[PDB]
């Protein structure tokens, strides 16, 4: 679907065989979630941020279908304040963005 | 034009006279740009996101031309790792994600 940006583009998403609400965000190279339950062995992290760095825990090779469509990738998972899909996501889905 | 998300997607602006590169963000609720030289009055104002918050000057009104477009807005400016084109102003130039 096109997608107008006079709110914020939210889509449902389902990980880990649990619903969630997430920003579609160009401007992230990552995909960040709220604490969560995620099954797996997963790595230390540091992610930067327009306020300093968080710490997070990363899962790689993590299944998630956004609006619909799947992909696979990194999801990190810790203090962030909104559920965030990044572009490791972003272009597995095909999403452009037009002007 | 379409641009996809397997990089970053900045894009060349001129603002306050000065050409600066910025982050297309569909995720960011405001255009937040780093340290520069603009003109007139301004207002503190305190942006959060991911690791905390920042302080930065808020310029309301401010004119500004993305990738040949025009559009008049809010432009905070502070400490931020990056220039950053939000959705106040990706409204203005017709931005639409796809997918
Ligand atoms: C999630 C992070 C992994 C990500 N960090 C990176 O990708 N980095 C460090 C590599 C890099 C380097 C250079 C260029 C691009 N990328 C990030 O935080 N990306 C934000 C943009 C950014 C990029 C670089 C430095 C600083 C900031 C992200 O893409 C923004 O969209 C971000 C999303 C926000 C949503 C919920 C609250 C925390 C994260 N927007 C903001 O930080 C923005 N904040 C808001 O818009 N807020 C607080 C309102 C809001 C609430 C809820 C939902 C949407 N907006 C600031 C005013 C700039």
Redesign the pocket.
Same mark, same amino acid.
């Given at each position: 679907p096109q997608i107008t940006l006079w709110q914020?583009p !939210?889509v449902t998403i389902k990980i880990g065989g649990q619903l969630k609400e997430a !920003?579609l965000?160009? /401007? %992230? &190279? &990552?995909?960040?979630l709220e604490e969560m339950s995620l099954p797996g062995k997963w790595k230390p992290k540091m =992610? /930067? /941020? =327009? *306020?300093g760095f968080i710490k997070v825990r990363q899962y790689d090779q993590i299944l998630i279908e956004i609006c619909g469509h799947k992909a696979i990738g990194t999801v990190?998972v810790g203090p962030?304040? %909104?559920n965030?899909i *990044?572009?490791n996501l972003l272009t597995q889905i095909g999403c452009t963005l037009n002007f």
């Open positions: 914020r !939210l !920003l965000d160009t /401007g %992230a &190279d &990552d995909t960040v =992610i /930067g /941020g =327009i *306020g990190l962030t304040p %909104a965030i *990044g572009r």
